[PDB]
Amino acid sequence: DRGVNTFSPEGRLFQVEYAIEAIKLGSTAIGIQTSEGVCLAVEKRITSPLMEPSSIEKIVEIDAHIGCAMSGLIADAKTLIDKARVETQNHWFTYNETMTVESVTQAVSNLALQFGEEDADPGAMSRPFGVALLFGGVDEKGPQLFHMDPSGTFVQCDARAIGSASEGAQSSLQEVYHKSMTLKEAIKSSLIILKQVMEEKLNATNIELATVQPGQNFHMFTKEELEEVIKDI
Amino acid sequence: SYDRAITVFSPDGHLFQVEYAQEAVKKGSTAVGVRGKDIVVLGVAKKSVAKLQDERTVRKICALDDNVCMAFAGLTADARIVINRARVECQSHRLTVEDPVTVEYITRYIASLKQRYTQSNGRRPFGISALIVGFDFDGTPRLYQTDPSGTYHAWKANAIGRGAKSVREFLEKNYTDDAIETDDLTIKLVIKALLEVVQSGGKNIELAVMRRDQPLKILNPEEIEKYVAEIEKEKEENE
Amino acid sequence: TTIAGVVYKDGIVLGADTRATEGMVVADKNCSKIHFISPNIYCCGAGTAADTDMTTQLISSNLELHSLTTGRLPRVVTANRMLKQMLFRYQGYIGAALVLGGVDVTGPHLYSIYPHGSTDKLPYVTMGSGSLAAMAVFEDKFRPDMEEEEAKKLVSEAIAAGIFNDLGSGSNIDLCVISKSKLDFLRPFSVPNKKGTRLGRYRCEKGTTAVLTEKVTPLE
Amino acid sequence: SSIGTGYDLSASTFSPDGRVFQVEYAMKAVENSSTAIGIRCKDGVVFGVEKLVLSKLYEEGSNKRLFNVDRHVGMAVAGLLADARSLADIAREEASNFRSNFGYNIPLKHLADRVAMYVHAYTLYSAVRPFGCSFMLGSYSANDGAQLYMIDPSGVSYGYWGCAIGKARQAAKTEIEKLQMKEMTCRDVVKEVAKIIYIVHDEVKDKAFELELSWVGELTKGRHEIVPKDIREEAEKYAKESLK
Amino acid sequence: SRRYDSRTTIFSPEGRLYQVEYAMEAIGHAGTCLGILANDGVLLAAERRNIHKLLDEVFFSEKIYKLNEDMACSVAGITSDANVLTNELRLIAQRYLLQYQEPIPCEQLVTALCDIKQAYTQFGGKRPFGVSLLYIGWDKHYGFQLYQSDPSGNYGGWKATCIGNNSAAAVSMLKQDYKEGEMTLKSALALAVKVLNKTMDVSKLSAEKVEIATLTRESGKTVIRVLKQKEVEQLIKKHEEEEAKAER
Amino acid sequence: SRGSSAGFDRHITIFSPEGRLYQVEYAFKAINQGGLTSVAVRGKDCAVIVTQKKVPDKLLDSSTVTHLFKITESIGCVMTGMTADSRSQVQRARYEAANWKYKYGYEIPVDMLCKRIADISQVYTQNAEMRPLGCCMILIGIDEEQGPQVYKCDPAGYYCGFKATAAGVKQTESTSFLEKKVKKKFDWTFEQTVETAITCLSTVLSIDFKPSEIEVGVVTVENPKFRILTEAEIDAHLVALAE
Amino acid sequence: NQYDNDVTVWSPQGRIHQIEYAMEAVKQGSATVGLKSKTHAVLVALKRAQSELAAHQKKILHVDNHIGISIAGLTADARLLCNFMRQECLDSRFVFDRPLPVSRLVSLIGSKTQIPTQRYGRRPYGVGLLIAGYDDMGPHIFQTCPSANYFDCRAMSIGARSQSARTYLERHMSEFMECNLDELVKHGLRALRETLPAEQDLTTKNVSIGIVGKDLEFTIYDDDDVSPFLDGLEERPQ
Amino acid sequence: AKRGYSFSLTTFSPSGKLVQIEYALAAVAGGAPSVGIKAANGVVLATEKKQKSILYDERSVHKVEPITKHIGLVYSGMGPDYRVLVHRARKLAQQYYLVYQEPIPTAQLVQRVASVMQEYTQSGGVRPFGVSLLICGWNEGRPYLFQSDPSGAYFAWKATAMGKNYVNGKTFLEKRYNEDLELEDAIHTAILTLKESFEGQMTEDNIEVGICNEAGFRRLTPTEVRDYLAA
Numbered sequence A: 001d002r003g004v005n006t007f008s009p010e011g012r013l014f015q016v017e018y019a020i021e022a023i024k025l026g027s028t029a030i031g032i033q034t035s036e037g038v039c040l041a042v043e044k045r046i047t048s049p050l051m052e053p054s055s056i057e058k059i060v061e062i063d064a065h066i067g068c069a070m071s072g073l074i075a076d077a078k079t080l081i082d083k084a085r086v087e088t089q090n091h092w093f094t095y096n097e098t099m100t101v102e103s104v105t106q107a108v109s110n111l112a113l114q115f116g117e118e119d120a121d122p123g124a125m126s127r128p129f130g131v132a133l134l135f136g137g138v139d140e141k142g143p144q145l146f147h148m149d150p151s152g153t154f155v156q157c158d159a160r161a162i163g164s165a166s167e168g169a170q171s172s173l174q175e176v177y178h179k180s181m182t183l184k185e186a187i188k189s190s191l192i193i194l195k196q197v198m199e200e201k202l203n204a205t206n207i208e209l210a211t212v213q214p215g216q217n218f219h220m221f222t223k224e225e226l227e228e229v230i231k232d233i
Numbered sequence B: 001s002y003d004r005a006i007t008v009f010s011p012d013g014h015l016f017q018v019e020y021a022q023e024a025v026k027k028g029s030t031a032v033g034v035r036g037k038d039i040v041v042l043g044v045a046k047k048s049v050a051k052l053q054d055e056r057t058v059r060k061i062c063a064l065d066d067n068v069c070m071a072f073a074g075l076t077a078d079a080r081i082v083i084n085r086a087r088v089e090c091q092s093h094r095l096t097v098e099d100p101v102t103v104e105y106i107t108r109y110i111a112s113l114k115q116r117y118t119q120s121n122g123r124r125p126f127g128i129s130a131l132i133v134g135f136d137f138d139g140t141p142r143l144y145q146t147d148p149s150g151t152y153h154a155w156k157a158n159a160i161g162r163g164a165k166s167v168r169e170f171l172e173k174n175y176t177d178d179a180i181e182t183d184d185l186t187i188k189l190v191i192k193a194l195l196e197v198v199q200s201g202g203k204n205i206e207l208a209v210m211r212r213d214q215p216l217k218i219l220n221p222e223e224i225e226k227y228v229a230e231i232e233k234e235k236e237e238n239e
Numbered sequence C: 001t002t003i004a005g006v007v008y009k010d011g012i013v014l015g016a017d018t019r020a021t022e023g024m025v026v027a028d029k030n031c032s033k034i035h036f037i038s039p040n041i042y043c044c045g046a047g048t049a050a051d052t053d054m055t056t057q058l059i060s061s062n063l064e065l066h067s068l069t070t071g072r073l074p075r076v077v078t079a080n081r082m083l084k085q086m087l088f089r090y091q092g093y094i095g096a097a098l099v100l101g102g103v104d105v106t107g108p109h110l111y112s113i114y115p116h117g118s119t120d121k122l123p124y125v126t127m128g129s130g131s132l133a134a135m136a137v138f139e140d141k142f143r144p145d146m147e148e149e150e151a152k153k154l155v156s157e158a159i160a161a162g163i164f165n166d167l168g169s170g171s172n173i174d175l176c177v178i179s180k181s182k183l184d185f186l187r188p189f190s191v192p193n194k195k196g197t198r199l200g201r202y203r204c205e206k207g208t209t210a211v212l213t214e215k216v217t218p219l220e
Numbered sequence D: 001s002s003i004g005t006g007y008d009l010s011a012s013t014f015s016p017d018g019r020v021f022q023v024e025y026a027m028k029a030v031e032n033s034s035t036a037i038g039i040r041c042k043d044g045v046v047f048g049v050e051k052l053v054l055s056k057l058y059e060e061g062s063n064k065r066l067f068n069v070d071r072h073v074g075m076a077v078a079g080l081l082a083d084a085r086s087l088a089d090i091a092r093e094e095a096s097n098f099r100s101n102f103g104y105n106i107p108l109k110h111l112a113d114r115v116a117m118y119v120h121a122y123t124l125y126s127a128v129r130p131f132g133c134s135f136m137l138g139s140y141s142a143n144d145g146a147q148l149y150m151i152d153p154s155g156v157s158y159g160y161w162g163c164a165i166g167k168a169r170q171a172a173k174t175e176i177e178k179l180q181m182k183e184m185t186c187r188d189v190v191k192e193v194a195k196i197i198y199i200v201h202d203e204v205k206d207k208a209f210e211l212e213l214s215w216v217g218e219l220t221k222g223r224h225e226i227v228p229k230d231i232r233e234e235a236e237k238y239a240k241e242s243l244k
Numbered sequence E: 001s002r003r004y005d006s007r008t009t010i011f012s013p014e015g016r017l018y019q020v021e022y023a024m025e026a027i028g029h030a031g032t033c034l035g036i037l038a039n040d041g042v043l044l045a046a047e048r049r050n051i052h053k054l055l056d057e058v059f060f061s062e063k064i065y066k067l068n069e070d071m072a073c074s075v076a077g078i079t080s081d082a083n084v085l086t087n088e089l090r091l092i093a094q095r096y097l098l099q100y101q102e103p104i105p106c107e108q109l110v111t112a113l114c115d116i117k118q119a120y121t122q123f124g125g126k127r128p129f130g131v132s133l134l135y136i137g138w139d140k141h142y143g144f145q146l147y148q149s150d151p152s153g154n155y156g157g158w159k160a161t162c163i164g165n166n167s168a169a170a171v172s173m174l175k176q177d178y179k180e181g182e183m184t185l186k187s188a189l190a191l192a193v194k195v196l197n198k199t200m201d202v203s204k205l206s207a208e209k210v211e212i213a214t215l216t217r218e219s220g221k222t223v224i225r226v227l228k229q230k231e232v233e234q235l236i237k238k239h240e241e242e243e244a245k246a247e248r
Numbered sequence F: 001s002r003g004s005s006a007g008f009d010r011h012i013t014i015f016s017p018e019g020r021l022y023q024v025e026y027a028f029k030a031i032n033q034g035g036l037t038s039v040a041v042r043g044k045d046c047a048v049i050v051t052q053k054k055v056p057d058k059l060l061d062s063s064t065v066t067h068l069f070k071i072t073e074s075i076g077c078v079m080t081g082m083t084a085d086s087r088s089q090v091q092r093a094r095y096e097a098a099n100w101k102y103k104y105g106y107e108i109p110v111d112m113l114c115k116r117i118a119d120i121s122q123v124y125t126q127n128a129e130m131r132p133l134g135c136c137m138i139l140i141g142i143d144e145e146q147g148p149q150v151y152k153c154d155p156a157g158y159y160c161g162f163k164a165t166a167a168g169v170k171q172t173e174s175t176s177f178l179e180k181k182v183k184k185k186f187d188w189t190f191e192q193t194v195e196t197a198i199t200c201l202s203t204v205l206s207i208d209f210k211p212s213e214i215e216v217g218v219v220t221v222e223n224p225k226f227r228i229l230t231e232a233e234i235d236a237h238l239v240a241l242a243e
Numbered sequence G: 001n002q003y004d005n006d007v008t009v010w011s012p013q014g015r016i017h018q019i020e021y022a023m024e025a026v027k028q029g030s031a032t033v034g035l036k037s038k039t040h041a042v043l044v045a046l047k048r049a050q051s052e053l054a055a056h057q058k059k060i061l062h063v064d065n066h067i068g069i070s071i072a073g074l075t076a077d078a079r080l081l082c083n084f085m086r087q088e089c090l091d092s093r094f095v096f097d098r099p100l101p102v103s104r105l106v107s108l109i110g111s112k113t114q115i116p117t118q119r120y121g122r123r124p125y126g127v128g129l130l131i132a133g134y135d136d137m138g139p140h141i142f143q144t145c146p147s148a149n150y151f152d153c154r155a156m157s158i159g160a161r162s163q164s165a166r167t168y169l170e171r172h173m174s175e176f177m178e179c180n181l182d183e184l185v186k187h188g189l190r191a192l193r194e195t196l197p198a199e200q201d202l203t204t205k206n207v208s209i210g211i212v213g214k215d216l217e218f219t220i221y222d223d224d225d226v227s228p229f230l231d232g233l234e235e236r237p238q
Numbered sequence H: 001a002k003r004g005y006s007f008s009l010t011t012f013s014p015s016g017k018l019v020q021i022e023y024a025l026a027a028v029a030g031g032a033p034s035v036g037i038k039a040a041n042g043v044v045l046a047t048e049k050k051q052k053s054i055l056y057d058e059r060s061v062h063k064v065e066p067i068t069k070h071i072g073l074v075y076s077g078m079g080p081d082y083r084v085l086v087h088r089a090r091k092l093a094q095q096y097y098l099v100y101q102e103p104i105p106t107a108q109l110v111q112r113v114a115s116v117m118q119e120y121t122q123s124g125g126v127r128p129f130g131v132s133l134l135i136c137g138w139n140e141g142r143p144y145l146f147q148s149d150p151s152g153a154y155f156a157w158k159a160t161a162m163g164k165n166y167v168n169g170k171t172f173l174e175k176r177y178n179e180d181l182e183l184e185d186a187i188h189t190a191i192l193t194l195k196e197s198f199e200g201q202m203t204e205d206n207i208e209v210g211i212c213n214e215a216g217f218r219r220l221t222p223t224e225v226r227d228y229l230a231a
């Protein structure tokens, strides 16, 4: 038995590396950066037909121009998402402008290693967040996709997959993705890869899709417009 | 001052303290609630009340606000704290926003409170799952549940506690528009689900109904025994 | 008030009047102003009446706690230090004009302590509204190393001077005689003032008051 | 002296034979570091340190193991350099607070005592670890003359005519006893400090090294200064020529 | 530092609090303490553990504590930990009276203390209070009441209950004789002597070995009365005639 | 019982199955780690302190090596044990003594200083966060009322007045020497009291000292000020011993 | 084995394992090369791709107008230290209206990084830095470690397979001080090149350059800005 | 650099026992014997004061300490621990007097002191006191005798003995003590109870005894102890 801020002989932190393993348990999520916009996809993994599928939100909006998709321990991300939402509004209040996708990713990444036992505040974290995040939005640099993990490392990705079957999904993305593909091609590609790795058959109420683009704001797909691309197998 | 990490990650990426708290709710009394189209009803089984015990003081169904009520499973002492924190929040939402609390909001508060107790120093997770029930100032009925981890979902019908697996799969079969037609039939679905675990209830069944018109109505062992007979002549109608 | 203290051949003689005032009215005709600090140290008090009572009690409490730990007789300087530093901390908001007197293993000691926390070590001291009148007696009649009964007479005459010449003071004279051998707390040492005998008969005869409501509750 | 469960895991824990091993292991850390030497002469104190060159990519005067604590006080460290640097800050601050409170330069005996008390505080608790370094303090004035104190990880301070701390500290002390020091001027002490370092330094064990010198005394008007390039080189010639 | 922490407020692999269950074992070693609800009142009966010839007997009681004008409690477990809780109970009762200007309702006093006991099981890192309490009282809402409290912070209202040594054997004995809505104070007292006779390992049962307190509504005010030796001896001799009634 | 262990009763300051505190017991053994012995003898006129002054190499400034410490003008002491711990307890002693005068307006009794340090040392006996100090303090001084005083406080928190005592490696053998000499009562003048202290340290170590091998501290009735004896004065007593 | 849990636990050999393990995190991240001339200080950093469908990690960060850093280890610890360095520089300019001397900033890092290595329940900073700065004393290259020890170096390289760069920097060391800016960067890249397997070397995707000096403030070159520096390349003579 | 542990060191064993308290009880059992007797006229407290070396000054440190003018104390177990409780009891006694201007009743003081002893069995990073207390006092025209042990529990006694041979002490007491013995006779039987467990022959510098009646609490002078030793 040890403390939470203990280094392994290799050089990495135990609790942080174990938190990465918690993502492997969570449902798979895909994001694709495109000239025309950014799409975010996630599987819900409904365990019972009695459970309302719309109450499982794994893609949420941070601002009009920024969306976020999580995987792992959903309950942990709720504070991270709220801190992100507060930061974009605080930025607007002070600077009268929208915050950049990279800045919001960076703000959240600062909270990642804010855990500890001794020398800690009355309301301090005890463990890292067991959640990976996919930030997708549009700013001055255009449509951008950012990935985050418990280690606090954040990096821009052309396309990224995180979750249980993230290994097979990423190689599927490397096979399909190239620089010039459209957003319509991006949504189509993300869903095909999603239906391959899912244990359950991909359905309209089974998944979530959201796109942020230069044209208009964050938009989550309804049952009808989900079915519009579900019928393309 | 006591800053010791209680809940930590395991080598395989698990949170044992959370999972152990989920074992504590498993040992608790069976709690089930179904959502109709006019009334929402929840009920608790696995009672085994000693008879010599005052049954009014051991009620597991509690009202939170004029429009929100909840049931639980697991550590009864833990729940009382959560219920009191949820009740304070219901009045605090009225002091800041004036508007009454929505069923989703109060669930989100309970969930965030339970989540905060899995990621804080010197604290141990809550060993309860809650079934939150209410009506929006919109007309639409609502049914939610929480668990020690802090994850919450909406349900058409759900069961947590002792033998939750058994009642969960009974509801999956028995939940149709025919079963939730009128007020009486939605109540029947709860009781029929409780008879899957409990050794012939009536005395061993606590259940309460909520309509969008009136507050909470807890049914007494006289009104519950009426449904024991009404479903009995349905069961003994095979010939 | 009038309070006074003197150092004689054998020890200390403390004096005080017994009048307490509320505005310009006599609140207590018989008040105790000479306070217990320790078996060997006593302290006269003037100023805010409540401040006098509570300050003198707290220090009496602290000294008893001190003497129990040391196992020896407390010193007047210890009482002085405890009073001085406390009153200073409160910047004179605790209105306690004090005369501190006692006998140590060091000998006889007398102090005057002001509400702001300044102390004077002197053979004779006066505090209170009638202190100047009392001082006029001390400056006129005091001699070094007086006999016990001579000093008793001097202090009682000083307090009397305050009593009769100051409106803030009146009634009885209290003395406290402390020596290496003996402690004498003479509460009513002198009764110079007395109420005139009633001449008229104002007996309110039974049933002279009209009653509207009556309830009698029995007891154990 | 090597018992199992606990006893040596904490600084708040005595061993059965009444020892605090965490303090002794912090002393083991200073014994593994290179040697630091200081001599008190008739008119000042001279320091010498064998700075080990870990890589040829480092500059001259890098990783100064010689410090200015106050305008009249010098510091020579051995052991874990990170802990030594933080102990220099404490030393500086205590020397700073004295001037602000009283007006004059802090006496070395008083400065040593205050810093040694701070070192000692880190030997009593499980919440902190002992410093893994020993250090020397040298000063000179017209009133007090030359003074030299040394403080080890335990928090003990003593006055020294000559002192050595580090890898070959016992081997160096046998070479210091050859010197008269009491009737020697500090001009000729720098000369001697240089060679003792070259003698004690193990050429086949430790490959490359650089010599650091500092002094405080009559010659430097009471200020602790670095030994000039001219004077250092003359002493290093005496070190290499007496190698025959 | 974390090596010396025994982790008092932690879940077990099976999902239970070890320090609470281990504390419950401590209650089972303490003296037998029971309570019975009647129609005309409510009583507590406790086994005296301070039973030495050389003891002084200065207080009115050993195990029974008066908390309120209308309320009283009894204790089973670590006696010092009980002194902390009983003192806190009196404060809570006074806080309520200061604010609302009426006596605290029985259930409200029990929950307030249980909130404290629950706290010591979830955070702080301290050991739980090794005490189980039985509460008796009257309020304007539910009348005569009887409540039980755990070290876990769990509480319950009972018509008849027992805690302490031979708790299980006593509760099944109460489960036999008790009549709901039919028990009078005389019949509840007779039951109390019977249950204690069987659970007492020294089955002679003198008045100096037991302790009985009654709570009655008397002409508008609540009366809490601890029965003295001559009253208790008389109750035992009544029960002793029932052992002589079996000879039929 | 006796020799039994359960839990961390040997690592922190908690009870063993016997009701012992091993961590406190180890601190007494930590006193012997200094490798030195102190002797304190009380006379009818004075109080005497004597300690081993070990200077192995001439590179050490002998003037800085001391275990005699000035706490007050009237109170001095000798420290036996771990040197870093000893100085810590001295600075605390000085602080307690100064604050006593400030609050109460008179000089702290030797009696009361020893009690105060013992009370502080008691905290380390009860709190698990820190180990007790591996040292022992013997205070001398002349009280205004009861004359010469000798007091000694432990790492355990025990304190007591003495006619004579010792501390350190040769503690148990020295106390046997003092017992024989107190049994045969003399006139305890400054001359014999100092000599007794030196002879006790001399016989128990079988060394026969040079004036640089020991350090002496005295407090006299006519001269209540605490004094550290110079080598000249020590040698004067040592040549007076040669009989 | 039992002495490797806490920074407060001393090993019987006189070592602290927790500090040594934190130092391993530096050797985990990709190599970065720091070198100076007489007027300029240059940081050349190799970037890691987690999967070449994603961008190469940010390795060079701004501190002030005259100071810049290249990190090796944990990113979140790197940004934490970076914010501390920024703050101290900002305070210096707020109070004194002049840039904070590089050596003084590094001394402050030494202070801040020492604290956790002596407190229980705390951990060392899992990042080593190479600091490039210019002040009154000319260009500077400083090295920091998880242990609060720091170095004032002529040139330095830390990271994965940074051993090969150390050899190159040592041999072409005497050429550095008299060298011009154009070739001073070339020497940096030719050092960073050695820290790569013989298949492929430096490109526009994986090279980041940070230059500060008497001429210009600290500027980061990354993609299109890095391609003039790569031109005039000399193939690997392995 | 310091803070403090916030977790209890006294915990419940699987068998349901607070092990540290029972081990602290072992410490008092191994302590020097002390006895207390209520005389219904006064209270007597007597303790063994074996000095072991003659070099020890007997009058320097006392085992029988006064809390205030009417309350007195003895212990069995650890000297240092007892002394902390002494200071705490004295301070508690003064708190009461400052509020009520009335000498604190023995029962109230004992309750307040026991609360402190309770704290050290539950508070963070501390062990219980290895001391049992004998508290005597005169108030309300009535004598009182109380015992406070490591757990924080108090008991009111007519007569009791603690420390070494507490079993032999009590069995001697109930055999010899009767609730009618006057203070003079109470002192005799207090010394006799110690004599039952002494082994070493008594002197007036070998035992400490304090009495408490309407005149207040005081320690008996060595001369008085010597005259009583003429048994």
Ligand SMILES: *[C@@](C)(CO)[C@](*)(O)[C@H](Cc1ccccc1)NC(=O)[C@H](Cc1ccc(OC)cc1)NC(=O)[C@H](C)NC(=O)CN1CCOCC1
Residues within 6 Å of the ligand: C001, C002, C019, C020, C021, C022, C023, C027, C031, C032, C033, C045, C046, C047, C048, C049, C050, C052, C053, C095, C128, C129, C168, C169
């Ligand atoms: C003589 C009588 C002054 O005229 C003495 O100083 C006497 C001191 C004394 C008396 C009894 C017991 C102990 C000591 N002082 C008083 O009798 C005093 C007069 C006074 C009134 C107001 C003051 O302003 C702060 C100061 C002195 N009388 C009182 O304390 C009376 C009983 N209380 C009040 O008048 C109410 N005060 C309290 C202080 O704050 C303002 C309202």
